Amino acid sequence: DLVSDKQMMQEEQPLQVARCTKIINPNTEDAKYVINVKQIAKFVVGLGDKVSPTDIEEGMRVGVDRNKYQI
Amino acid sequence: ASRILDNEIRILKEDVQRTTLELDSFKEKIKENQEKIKLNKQLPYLVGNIVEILEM
Amino acid sequence: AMEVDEKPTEDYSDIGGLEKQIQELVEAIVLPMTHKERFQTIGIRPPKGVLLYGPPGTGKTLMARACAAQTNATFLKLAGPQLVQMFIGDGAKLVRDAFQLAKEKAPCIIFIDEIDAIGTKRFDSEVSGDREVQRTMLELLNQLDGFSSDERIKVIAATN
Amino acid sequence: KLLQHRELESRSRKVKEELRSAKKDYTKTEDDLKSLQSVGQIIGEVLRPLDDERLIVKASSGPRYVVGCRSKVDKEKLTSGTRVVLDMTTLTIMRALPREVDPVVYNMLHEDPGNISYSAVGGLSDQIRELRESIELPLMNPELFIRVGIKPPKGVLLYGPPGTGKTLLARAIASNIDANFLKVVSSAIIDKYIGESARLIREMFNYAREHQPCIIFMDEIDAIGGRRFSEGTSADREIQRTLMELLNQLDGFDQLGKVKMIMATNRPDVLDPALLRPGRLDRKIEIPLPNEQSRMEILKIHGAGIAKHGEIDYEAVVKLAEGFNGADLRNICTEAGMSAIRAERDYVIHEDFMKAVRKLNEAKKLESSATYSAD
């Protein structure tokens, strides 16, 4: 019942799929994180505004912005 | 001291031209930077191999 | 993951009853690793490859942990069976990347423990025989010395 | 006086230089402004043209459409199977490029800087001459063999007990062209991809056909060769397929002329029955363990940079060196220094080699002692 007009428009409109992938390692001198997909493609990407830079684990499973292609 | 005036005028003209050249360079750098950084806003990219570099 | 970064703390005296082995091995790795000019003057290729065998608990992990804390370099920790994969030749790539990462820091030692995993004697059979495992063994052999080898690091191997 | 003009010109020169440097610095960046405004083109391999302008080519991606080319690209120059760029957005022919380069090909092409000289090689002087007649004699005057009445050697594989050092033979043979040589470990050519295992071999023979005078040596040939596959593994199918593809490309409806391949393997008994046939394996030259004279020659080769005293009796060591392997002599020479490194004795005494030989003779007690079998 919750998702009828608002919750569905909140459980659906608010969030994104943010498909999960695997990280390789970041590059020094900057954020310079590397995006890699097991079955899609590798790519130079970056994390999102809602993550810390101490936790940039190299080889970490995480999802990136479905559009921005940013974790 | 007769030819000193012509040399001073030439030096002043050269300094004025140098000031204008410096201003033109400063103005032109902004346009190049606005595009270089605008392109640098594209961290999302592709990672691949290198095949060859011909002479074309 | 083969990058030793925890600095395993072990003392030479903490090794029980193997001072002769310590003298024999350290001078075979440490000396070329801490005094290059000594070998450069006399003239010889630095010894390459240390293989330790013996009883199940005769002590090889102790020697490896002592060597790790002894030298002022980066030691490479590789597990014997660890370097394999279901993919065709994926172990070859895992061993080549191992050798490359080891070349990353010229001062470094790579230890392939339980070398019997890849050191299995080749067999003659049609059906099976661990062709992939033999391929990994051959890749390790090629990366070790021969065609386009390197004299920058020393590898300590432990086989039971 | 004109002395005042020189002082004033020092400011005009600086004004001009300050403008020229700024203009050059700005142009350097502005060049990238127009450089990064283009787009790349997809690359495909043509199948055939259907119309005077209609051609069918499969791009490097997959399903191939039919498109045209520029009205001045010399359509006839578009070979049936040519590699050219397409109008990536439009998917039309724009410009053609030579065949592929298989970056793995380069990786295995200019990665051998070995400069071994035949003097260094030893123990196989008769074998050195045979191998020369095996590979370089053919490129020297194949008309000689033709007048003989037989074709030149196709491919020779090197037989030698483990630790024989045959690889050194090939490293030295690389001293005949240094650019017309091919050496692949025959074990990095394997991959878990769909079919690239055969792709490596295909690229090998292609790059070889590209440059006529050149040889391809593939050490560790005993790995990809094998005996056969009894339906045991899921790679043996693909591995056996790769082996057969090399077999086919060897003498399959086409002769790779002006180029012969020499391979080496420690276990000639695990060789597939086909690879030993006259079409694939031309002749088998076996490198045995060094003889007494061969052992002395090897010791002398390795005995170059030894600071010793004039009492080094290599004859005693040579008589002591029984059944030693080829690399073994180098190991003894190295251990000589290690013994000399002990006690910090700068010179090398004849006793150092006498103790190194004894240590080596006792270290190898755990061996197998199974040389080879050429069947």
From Swiss-Prot, chain A:
Source organism superkingdom: Eukaryota
UniProt subcellular location: Cytoplasm; Nucleus
Purpose: The 26S proteasome is involved in the ATP-dependent degradation of ubiquitinated proteins. The regulatory (or ATPase) complex confers ATP dependency and substrate specificity to the 26S complex.
Similarity-based family: Belongs to the AAA ATPase family.
UniProt-recorded name of the protein: 26S proteasome regulatory subunit 7
Species: Spinacia oleracea (Spinach)
Organism ancestry: Eukaryota, Viridiplantae, Streptophyta, Embryophyta, Tracheophyta
Portion of the full sequence shown: 72 to 142 of 426
